[PDB]
């Protein structure tokens, strides 16, 4: 079925197989799901339905849609542009690490499965050469599993501080260059989709996730990992970090407030069903996130079983959990290098598809907003090459010895936290109060046939902005510092630059409001009347 194959080619992504178990292990195991399902019900469905319906209604790019829906709140589009720029900066480095893992995979013995190399320290131990072994005192002397040592001391060569930026890793730089040039190849030759290439590269991630889950439940001692994954702690619910990270994991995995969802709506015709597609896409995305959570948490439960250390601190808990638990899982398969290279090629495919659609949405929005310059002299591909070069040069600051902290900062403060919360708040205020939810419900009735069931309407008015503003204020007043491996206590200038770019991602809305008020002034009531009123027939 063409409908089943194309939809399944969009449910999976790196935000479900890499970011969700990272956020579910850093911010408490079982306590992450309680604000996960709340935002899933109250902010995933309504805002996903809102952005898809607005994109299909206006049927154009992601920032001029907000121009013709509400010219006052046109700054919501530019914030999504800045979020897209930050994502395209840091969503390609994950593919660089997966390429580096793919480069080292083609060997009869896996690099992350032995306790002897140039990077393995004295406190290493095999954890496989003997059953009872000689641990429980080596663990007191900080015993470390070989994959946990391999990732740090060879993949990125971690340093003891963000102020300790070491030499740039040239192998990772060539990996990033390969990732950017294959993304540019996908831009030029590869837009012509369908054929025999979609029946293979869409069902492949589900087969691999199924076999990885089947292995993960077969791993001994995974009951402890699943219990840690499911049983919640209320003391781990008392902090705002869990709520913020769960809400913005909902917003990130669904591409909510990123900016490409308005472009997704414009691709469909005027009479496509928003409600059924939104419901089934969101439910299947949450389901595959839940399945990947099962797989990784069972694997690290087995890791904590085979070590003497408990579950809470057995992996990195930074954004390399999918690069630590999953390569640990593939070591136990028969014919391990084949499964490892198939896994890493899966990661390349499902990261490259999302990076492709992100950069394509960004470039088509920036050439729709600049129509007379980039559509007359055959320079759209030149702009794509320039954007790729610029994002490759700005992205290289993370590839150093100490750039992992910079990557963690931009991951938690660019397409996450206050940026996504602010954009969702202002989006829902715009639709529910400025454009009018009755008018938008009438537009949805004219589009798909039936109005929203008024639960989504009341979510647009009072539920979603209320809960997101509550989470915003709760994070603001009770500030908690961010720690990389759950204990780092970042320097103040790192928090300063993270908050600076998080502001610059979200201060574009009131700045655009201010310059729109100043540019066309007819005193306050005429200004608000002429800015509230939409443009043309939409």
């Amino acid at each position, epitope marked *: 079925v063409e409908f089943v194959l194309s939809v399944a080619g969009e449910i999976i992504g790196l935000g479900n197989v890499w970011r969700f178990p990272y956020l579910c292990y850093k911010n408490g195991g079982g306590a992450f799901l309680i604000p996960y399902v709340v935002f899933f019900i109250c902010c995933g469905i309504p805002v996903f339905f809102l952005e898809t319906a607005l994109g299909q209604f206006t049927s154009e790019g992601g920032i001029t849609c907000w121009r013709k829906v509400c010219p006052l709140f046109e700054g919501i589009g530019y914030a999504t542009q800045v979020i897209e720029a930050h994502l395209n900066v840091y969503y390609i480095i994950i593919l660089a690490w997966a390429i580096f893992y793919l480069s080292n995979c083609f060997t009869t013995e896996l690099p992350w499965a032995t306790c002897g190399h140039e990077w393995n320290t004295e406190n290493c131990v095999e954890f496989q050469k003997l059953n009872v072994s000689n641990y429980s005192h080596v663990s007191l002397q900080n015993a470390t599993s070989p994959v946990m040592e391999f990732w740090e001391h060879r993949v990125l060569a971690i340093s003891d501080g963000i102020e300790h930026i070491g030499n740039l890793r040239w192998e990772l730089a060539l990996c990033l260059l390969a990732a950017w040039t294959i993304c540019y190849f996908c831009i030029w030759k590869g837009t012509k989709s369908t054929g025999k290439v979609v029946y293979v590269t869409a069902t492949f991630p589900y087969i691999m996730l199924l076999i990885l889950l089947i292995r993960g439940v077969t791993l001994p001692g995974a009951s402890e990992g699943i219990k840690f994954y499911l049983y919640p702690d209320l003391s781990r619910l008392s902090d705002p970090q869990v709520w913020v990270d769960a809400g913005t994991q909902i917003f990130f995995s669904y591409a909510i407030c990123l900016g490409c969802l308005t472009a997704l709506g414009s691709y469909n015709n005027y009479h496509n069903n928003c409600y059924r597609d939104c419901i089934m896409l969101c439910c299947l995305n949450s389901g595959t996130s839940f399945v990947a959570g099962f797989a990784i948490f069972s694997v690290l439960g087995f890791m904590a079983y085979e070590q003497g250390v408990p579950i809470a601190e057995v992996a990195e808990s930074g954004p390399g959990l999918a690069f630590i638990a999953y390569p640990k899982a593939v070591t136990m398969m028969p014919l391990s290098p084949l499964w490892a290279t198939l896994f890493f090629m899966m990661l390349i495919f499902l990261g490259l598809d999302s990076q492709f659609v992100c950069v394509e949405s960004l470039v088509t929005a920036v050439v729709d907003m600049y129509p007379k310059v980039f559509r007359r002299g055959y320079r759209r591909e030149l702009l794509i090459l320039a954007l790729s070069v610029i994002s490759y040069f700005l992205g290289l600051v993370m590839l150093t010895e100490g750039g992992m902290y910079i990557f963690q900062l931009f991951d938690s403060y660019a397409a996450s936290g206050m940026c996504l919360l602010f954009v969702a708040i202002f989006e829902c205020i715009c639709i529910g109060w400025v454009y009018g939810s*009755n008018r938008f419900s*009438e537009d949805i009735r*004219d589009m798909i*046939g*039936f*109005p929203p069931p008024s639960l989504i309407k009341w979510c647009w008015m009072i539920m979603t902005p209320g809960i997101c503003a509550g989470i915003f204020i709760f994070f603001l007043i009770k500030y908690k510092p961010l720690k990389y491996n759950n204990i780092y206590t970042y320097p103040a200038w790192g928090y300063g630059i993270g908050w600076l770019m998080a502001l610059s991602s979200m201060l574009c809305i009131p700045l655009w409001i201010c310059i729109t008020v100043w540019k066309t002034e007819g005193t306050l009531p005429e200004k608000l009347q002429k800015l509230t009123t939409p443009s043309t027939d939409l």
Partner: antibody
Amino acid sequence: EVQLVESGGGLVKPGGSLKLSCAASGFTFSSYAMSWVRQSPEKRLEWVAEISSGGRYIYYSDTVTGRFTISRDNARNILHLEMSSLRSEDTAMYYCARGEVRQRGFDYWGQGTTLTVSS
Amino acid sequence: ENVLTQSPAIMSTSPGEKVTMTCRASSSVGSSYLHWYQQKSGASPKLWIYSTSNLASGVPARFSGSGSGTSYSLTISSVEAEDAATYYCQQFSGYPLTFGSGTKLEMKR
């Protein structure tokens, strides 16, 4: 419970004009779209017009477009349908249907005002 | 103009007898947009079957629509004296909206 009572209608001259009025009660008139359905004296049913729940999405059939206008009033819970240049072919008995969800249909109908055009 | 036609225009059914109407569509219509009505002799039509499978409030369960694509049918198990009327089929897929020709359910004795 819900009464889609209708007024207006009667004998009109050919080429004249008439103003049919449909009054709704027992429900939120501003939350459900409205349509006018006519029934020919040969007992043939056809759709005339449709206005949305707000009043800006207006559709017509190809037999009445240009001469027929449809209005709305969410304050007094009333509906209108004004016609011009009535010929001998658009004589019927007009119903005031109510259809908002397109997967539900015209669930609640009116009574029907007999309309006659003759010389 | 999705010209819908129904055959036969006139029909006669004994009580407790199988009966199946039809509603042929000119162009393709959605499976969830085609409706069925029932107008008694001297009364306003009421919604009978919506989205060709469901039933409106108060409709007995012996009515059951079927079909998809362009060929749609209305099946009644055991008719009685309470449902002698005319049935029309509508579509909301394409504009302008069209109705069926109408099948008159008659009784013999």
